[PDB]
Design a protein around this ligand. Sequence first.
Ligand SMILES: Cc1cc2nc3c(=O)[nH]c(=O)nc-3n(C[C@H](O)[C@H](O)[C@H](O)COP(=O)(O)O)c2cc1C
Ligand SMILES: Cc1cc2nc3c(=O)[nH]c(=O)nc-3n(C[C@H](O)[C@H](O)[C@H](O)COP(=O)(O)O)c2cc1C
Ligand SMILES: COc1cc(S(=O)(=O)O)c(C)cc1/N=N/c1c(O)ccc2cc(S(=O)(=O)O)ccc12
Ligand SMILES: COc1cc(S(=O)(=O)O)c(C)cc1/N=N/c1c(O)ccc2cc(S(=O)(=O)O)ccc12
Lengths: 202, 201
Amino acid sequence: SMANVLVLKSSINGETSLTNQLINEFLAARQAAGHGDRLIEHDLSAMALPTLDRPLFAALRGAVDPQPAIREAVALSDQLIAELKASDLLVIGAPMYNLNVPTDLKKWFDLVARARETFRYTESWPQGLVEGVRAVVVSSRGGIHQGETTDAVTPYLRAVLGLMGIQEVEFIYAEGLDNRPHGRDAGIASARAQIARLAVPA
Amino acid sequence: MANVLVLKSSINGETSLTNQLINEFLAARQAAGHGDRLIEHDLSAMALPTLDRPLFAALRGAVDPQPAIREAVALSDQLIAELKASDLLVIGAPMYNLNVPTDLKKWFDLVARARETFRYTESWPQGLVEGVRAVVVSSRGGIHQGETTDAVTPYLRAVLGLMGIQEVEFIYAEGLDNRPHGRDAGIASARAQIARLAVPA
Ligand SMILES: Cc1cc2nc3c(=O)[nH]c(=O)nc-3n(C[C@H](O)[C@H](O)[C@H](O)COP(=O)(O)O)c2cc1C
Ligand SMILES: Cc1cc2nc3c(=O)[nH]c(=O)nc-3n(C[C@H](O)[C@H](O)[C@H](O)COP(=O)(O)O)c2cc1C
Ligand SMILES: COc1cc(S(=O)(=O)O)c(C)cc1/N=N/c1c(O)ccc2cc(S(=O)(=O)O)ccc12
Ligand SMILES: COc1cc(S(=O)(=O)O)c(C)cc1/N=N/c1c(O)ccc2cc(S(=O)(=O)O)ccc12
């Protein structure tokens, strides 16, 4: 009855990382609420994920490319698509970096959002092929953006996950960390309160 | 006259529609009497490094004697000096999985820089790039104008505004993968946006 949780960490701050700190605190809170978790942990920061270019996009679509480096990336694309389809809970660390997600997290979506694999084109809108997967997004920010137009990370993550079928996303925000005194403490405290709510639905 | 910095980011190569419409936009400007000097960048081919811990530290001004790091520090210097000396920034940014192409985001990750293009002050960090507008070329396989699924638009407005580029125009080619003539109506629409936006010099 153990949950299958795929953990994607994309911060570059190493040990100092807050989205990764809040991911761990969120994981323990799930255990502290009676959940046995099976974790596949991917530090996207240190995996050197490949970038999507014209040759790689064709092998991901079908074309024969007997390049050792391109054959290896399609293998990585398949394993990542396999892990995501096999899990119950996708937990994404998405700190705001220059008003976008971190590049390595974007590279993951580039290798995981694939036609015939995670979605398929319908006469109307693409249909997702990932079934029964929840998404919880940790996202610490410098200033505060949730609600306003300058927040691009939030509507981005919703659209790209929904394209693949994950129409269940829940955000743990930690905005306002640039204000040295209260700002950091309040945003973290708000996230830790959001954590305690989200660590219950199992 | 106008100093233009054209940024191409599509991966389709010579079949790229954004690159075609970037050209169609620049020719229509010369038709309206605008003689541009161009710095041209196909970010697909320059293999821009990814933002990581040591590079960000070096880009922030820290002493980082690492060789490969120092080169990307120079790549940020040169990429910013072009932008600061420009009059018109033209961006090709088609929707790639509801974000922008990765090779574009890496340029922003190198051009959005503290004590260079933006400065933190009490309240919101203020911009440091003066005299620059922006025209974004963005084609999409589906209809995303005005919807929540469009993050390219609010991201580009936000990240260009962060460094001071406030006037940003958008040229859209929506629903290019429709059964009847979605590719046609989308391009013809963007061409109607070509003719309007090419005038203001
Ligand atoms: C490279 C970099 C870029 C950032 N860009 C933004 C930004 O555009 N807007 C913002 O509000 N905060 C920005 N921040 C602040 C982060 O959101 C904040 O540091 C957050 O805690 C990072 O979480 P992490 O340590 O898990 O990466 C940026 C931080 C870094 C390191
Ligand atoms: C890798 C890739 C991802 C794409 N993702 C989207 C998408 O998420 N939504 C959409 O409407 N169209 C998407 N498209 C279709 C493009 O928007 C369309 O093909 C556009 O005209 C590409 O222009 P370009 O040749 O300059 O790259 C995608 C195309 C590619 C190649
Ligand atoms: C582009 O960068 C930023 C953009 C904006 S905004 O667009 O106006 O919203 C804001 C409000 C802040 C930003 N600075 N971000 C950091 C950074 O660049 C480096 C180290 C940091 C260390 C910490 S901290 O954890 O040690 O406290 C916190 C933040 C940063
Ligand atoms: C996540 O990917 C997508 C999401 C959506 S969405 O859910 O509705 O937002 C849509 C509508 C299309 C998408 N991908 N489409 C292409 C693609 O994957 C590869 C090559 C293409 C070449 C051309 S073309 O210009 O040469 O005809 C056109 C489209 C593609």
